[PDB]
Amino acid sequence: PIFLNVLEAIEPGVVCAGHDNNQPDSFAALLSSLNELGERQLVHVVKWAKALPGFRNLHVDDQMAVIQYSWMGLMVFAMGWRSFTNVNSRMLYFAPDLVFNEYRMHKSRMYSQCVRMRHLSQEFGWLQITPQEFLCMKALLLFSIIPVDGLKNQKFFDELRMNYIKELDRIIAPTSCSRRFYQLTKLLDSVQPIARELHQFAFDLLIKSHMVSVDFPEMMAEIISVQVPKILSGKVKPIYFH
Ligand SMILES: CC(C)(O)C(=O)Nc1ccc([N+](=O)[O-])c(C(F)(F)F)c1
Known part of the structure; x- marks a missing residue:
């Protein structure tokens, strides 16, 4: 199980927020921790x-x-x-x-x-x-959103995405496989609308951060002000199965 061995081996460990749970909840503190x-x-x-x-x-x-x-x-x-x-x-x-x-x-x-x-x-x-389905689906999510004007080399991306779909096919493996693939692809598509709502929220918060006492880390602020607007303005779109 070469492919799955790798996905399991590289899966991130526990990541902590550094939040102070020994203090009353406040919007400012909760969002600073997020x-x-x-x-x-x-x-x-x-x-x-x-x-x-x-x-x-x-x-x-x-x-x-x-x-x-x-x-x-x-x-x-x-x-x-x-x-x-x-x-x-x-x-x-x-x-x-x-x-x-x-x-x-x-x-x-x-x-x-x-x-x-x-x-x-x-x-x-x-x-x-x-x-195992979780691991493969999560990997495929990385290859599920692209720019309309195209990537530097779209062909290499298309090949890679196809191969990850093939791996999902293998993990699943007739009618039973088809039903499962339908379920998983529907679940995958459902993540995009949620991510969009979060993108909108993060963007709005960044714009009003100075007035809400919310602190934004360097890399996040970069992505939210440079990359996220490309998605929100429709230049970058998710690849839906359905
Ligand atoms: C508000 C903002 C941009 O900090 C944010 O959405 N943060 C955030 C942090 C962690 C996680 N997480 O899955 O571990 C998530 C979320 F993906 F759940 F929504 C958002």
Whole structure:
């Protein structure tokens, strides 16, 4: 199981937010921690992506781009899985030290987005997603959002995406395989709308950060002000199965 051996070997370990849970919840503190957690997670997402089979087949300029565009979606999918495996979807497990109950979902002003992520988390259980299906689907998510004007070398990207779909095919393997593929691709598509709502929220917050006492880390601020608007303005779009 060469491919799956690799995906398991490179899967990131636990990442903490550094949040002060021994203090009353406040919008400012909760979002400052979400931003810090995001910066911390981005570091791991980059190291993970660069270690994926065939990733070096991509043009160097397309490598960071694909990571930046897919970052939110990758985080959402992984968080949903952690929430399912750790707390049976009872709460959103952003990090061991940043678990969201409904009060925090409300305090964070990200309630609608959080409920959708809780639903995604429940889906992992309802569809009985296996750890191996999770790993392969998460990898495919990295190759699911591209620019309309094209990547430096679109062909290398198209080949890589096809190969990851083939690997998902193998993990699944007739009618039974078809039904499963339908379920998984539907689940994958469902991550994009959620990531979009989070992109919009992060963007709006960054623009008003100076007035809400929210602090934005260097790399995150860069992605949110440079890459995210490309997605929100329609220049960069997700690749839906359906
Ligand atoms: C508000 C902002 C940009 O900090 C943010 O969405 N942060 C953030 C941090 C971590 C995680 N995570 O999955 O570990 C997520 C999210 F993907 F759940 F939504 C968002």
